[PDB]
Symmetry: D2
Subunit: 323 residues, 4 copies
């Protein structure tokens, strides 16, 4: 039987005996992702270029993507606190639309590299609100371990949605002919060991010696096995998704312009660590699992090394040698 995101989510909610609040949240998010995909693919650009007679386009797509997610989540009546990469402060849902869930997300990562048209994505993580206080940014300060659901959408050669929950990781492809997400990979598990590593080696001068030794082992394997291949798109969704599909390791460690790391814990590192862990992979800061970090600030950064367990374990052995 063919399965769709809507049917899958509804059936998991029935199995969970949920009220349908998280189901409506996930439905609303899926609708936003379909609308972001349409805009990313430049539907209607002819009108902006004067087909009917009439600034920073990359920023403006980021703003529109933020507005789509915010409006769809607000109107789900399922959320109370929304944290977005695009917004300095957490957004507090108005009382009349308040639900029980906290959503942290990056609606799009264009600002940087959408001019070259290769890959942008949406990343989200969903928490149950934990405290009984009036809603505030503190409700988003939960460790990744508390996530009830997380995932991402890749707007690449096709549009794919990856959704991780307690049941595991499932991959859906957007069929643009009918605007439906079709289930194409069920209960996805990452390979135990890969053959690709992914990181910005332009930071080589600023890497700590554990990263430098680990990367040297991939290029010059001390057992003269074949060296790993390298890939680095520079868009987290693209690099993490390749890691999930083929196995291997993705690294964004701390460097000098970023000694707490570069990627953001709440809506980049934690969702991807959750997907990885649910797929049987790993995600570490070097010192602890990403999901165990207790955040103190909604936009705080984190180092992240994630992917196949044998590869991350091998990095951690090198990291322990240097500690």
């Amino acid at each position: 039987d063919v399965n769709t995101l809507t049917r899958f989510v509804m059936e998991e909610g029935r199995k969970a005996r949920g009220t349908g609040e998280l189901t409506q949240l996930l439905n609303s998010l899926c609708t936003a992702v379909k609308a972001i995909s349409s805009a990313v693919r430049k539907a209607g650009i002819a009108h902006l270029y004067g087909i009917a007679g009439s600034g920073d386009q990359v920023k403006k797509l980021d703003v529109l993507s933020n507005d789509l997610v915010m409006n769809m989540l607000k109107s789900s009546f399922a959320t109370c606190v929304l944290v977005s990469e695009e917004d300095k402060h957490a957004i507090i849902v108005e009382p009349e639309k308040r639900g029980k869930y906290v959503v942290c997300f990056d609606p799009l990562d264009g600002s940087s590299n959408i001019d070259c048209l290769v890959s942008v994505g949406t990343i989200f993580g969903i928490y149950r609100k934990k405290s009984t206080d009036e809603p505030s940014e503190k409700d988003a300060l939960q460790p990744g371990r508390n996530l009830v659901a997380a995932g991402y959408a890749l707007y690449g050669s096709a549009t794919m949605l990856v959704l991780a929950m307690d049941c595991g990781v499932n991959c859906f492809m957007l069929d643009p002919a009918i605007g439906e997400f079709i289930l194409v990979d069920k209960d996805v598990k990452i390979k135990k060991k890969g053959k690709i590593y992914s990181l910005n080696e332009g930071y080589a001068k600023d890497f700590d010696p554990a990263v430098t030794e680990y990367i040297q082992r991939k290029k010059f394997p001390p057992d003269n096995s074949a060296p790993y291949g390298a890939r680095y798109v520079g868009s987290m969704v693209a690099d993490v998704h390749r890691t999930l599909v083929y196995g291997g390791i993705f690294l964004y460690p701390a460097n000098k312009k970023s000694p707490n790391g570069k990627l953001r814990l709440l809506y980049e590192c934690n969702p991807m660590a959750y997907v990885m862990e649910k797929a049987g992979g790993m995600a570490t800061t070097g010192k602890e699992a990403v999901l165990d970090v207790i955040p103190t600030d909604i936009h705080q950064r984190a180092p992240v090394i994630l992917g196949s367990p044998d590869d991350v374990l091998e990095f951690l052995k090198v990291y322990e040698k240097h500690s």
Copy 2:
């Protein structure tokens, strides 16, 4: 004033006082690219997965998409009545157009790079180079053995976050964005020029153990600049269209170099290196094998390989300085 690919090509055809054959070729290619884009974005995949009770999902779906793209380009170019010899990355021998449909042009192309690209969910592309047949001989694979200097038009389609067509001719390089609401390529960047010097390098650093020593030294200088300027950033998608387009838009350098195990590189001259070298030179960039300009190599086999280092001129010239140091 709004501009579409169709109108742009038609107007360039009128300015050159062409008969319309090349205009028909380019129209046919544009239609093929729109059809590849629709297939790459997975239109109709629900039917493959049984929404109407019929399930396929049979073989290597990535290979099947490459083959479909090849069939789209082949068929559209054959039915243009503008071509006589078609060389495709997907085909062992050159395809000879049937006598009733032969026109004046030779087209070399890679219709899609899905099977050679682990980042194919991130992006795939189509690359093409168009030549005029030079002799009246009965058409054969020899007609595609021209140096890239002889190109009349070349370019690529990037199937990325959006679909873009980059078309280079004597008038320069122009970039068109596909509006999927109406199926028109809209002119969005006119007479594009690459920046003189970039800040990004692009190559597979997993080959590092077997790098040619000039590549090792050059990349070492990108990471550890001897003058203590800021290091270059690295990017490598593994799809030539994506990596070359980034180089065009942002500047920098792209390398698929030779080494002792692959003394002629890995990428293919006719339908990868030459089209991208032509776009680069028309944009004010450079494209070298290390020993000569890519566009000056006279090919002897339709699938022959070439090393290629291309991008912003100051960066390519710096690489050649290091190359000469090791020569």
Copy 3:
């Protein structure tokens, strides 16, 4: 606040305190309608005409009425919500396999008007949903319920745009399909038909065989006795298109009986009853002449029924002329 069909259906399910089964049925139906709409607008026709050569053509080669039936049948079976399915395209009712069985009975016309799709006339999909009542193993007999028993009914119109009209206990709601994102957007809530309209709709070419009551009533519309302005005429020849015009603009639609066709032409289970249910939930009427369409107890799943529907004042006036020819 923007509302999608998915959010609307889910919210109405939470309100009614349902288990989710009907919600999944409507979700599955909405997905089939989007697929039908994509095919009706001829997505992929270029492959049929050889864009990639002769060999690059499975579902692509099926006629639209065949494909549409497969889409609705498959999506409904896979909803796990149905047990008996009746379609214009199959002589016998389909009994869903036990492992996919749910509580509901769906009667549908997957692509009405496709007889004339060659001229690009609007076509549609019509559906009525019942809950199974009987104790027994599911059989064709569970579809033999009167329209009064419907829990939901409606239609999709593939016109200049694609719209889904969904009628339930809570009224009639209209959703426009946004093709950029594959979402049905709520555009008209709790729709009510006008009390009286100014358009009549029937095939006048068959006037020679008209029932005498239909003859007189149509003459009143063309030559009003009170010297009021005559009604306009409209007949698309596609029931979903004519009924939707009637709903949106008011007026009257007729597919009546004559003595060549004593029970009319349109099918009761999956043409007349869904449209009668939409009309009543909108404040309109639908009659066979002798009784309400929704009160007819069917004895055959493909049985025909005469239908006269539209604004209440218009249908009342027809009933008067019809009662006069008692």
Copy 4:
């Protein structure tokens, strides 16, 4: 071999040894029609209804055709049902063609999702004079090309030129018009008649008699069926594909018909005549009427030749 509108039009231009100007005009019109089709199918309607938190179709449709034709560099005078006066193209964008069009026929009933369409007629300017409104006052016989796009269950463009009538289906997967029916010819005689029978009280007696002949046939044949969508593009397109007859005759609110000669009657009459059909006002061929007003109305009776001749026979009796 598959063919597209773009490739078809370009090849016909190569055959006629055109300079490319009329080809650019038809390319530009094709683009406008795809954009109108997108808007008619309601792409983007979710944004209007607040999906991201906060023009009418015939105005947008007019803007699309107007701007695409102006930027074609192929036109000098533009008449639209939407504009009271003819639009004169500025000198820098001026070509030799005059285009009369209805950007979105049937649109005022678009709330019921009725099929709508775009109708166009293209003439060549004769004079050396500066362009003006008078240059669109030409008889339908002077047309170099005409046709329509129907935004029905699918979108199709019907293009008529000297070479005949050709039908193209818009494939929304790729945004290409695909040639699906070549050198189309209408049936010699049909079985459907199309007119608003609500005006029966005002019908000219020839119309009344002709319609009676369709319902009560004089010759041992079955009655014609009736269809009247109420959008001319839909009714005429059905008339083309199934054969038959379409009538909008003189009634009392419209004593010289309701349909507009320059951008409704003329293009449909040209399509009909190129397809082997006919189109008459009753007194003469539609294409032979010399217009004196760019928005003048005409009665029209068109369709299969045997049915039009049959109407003309009844009409001449009463005349």
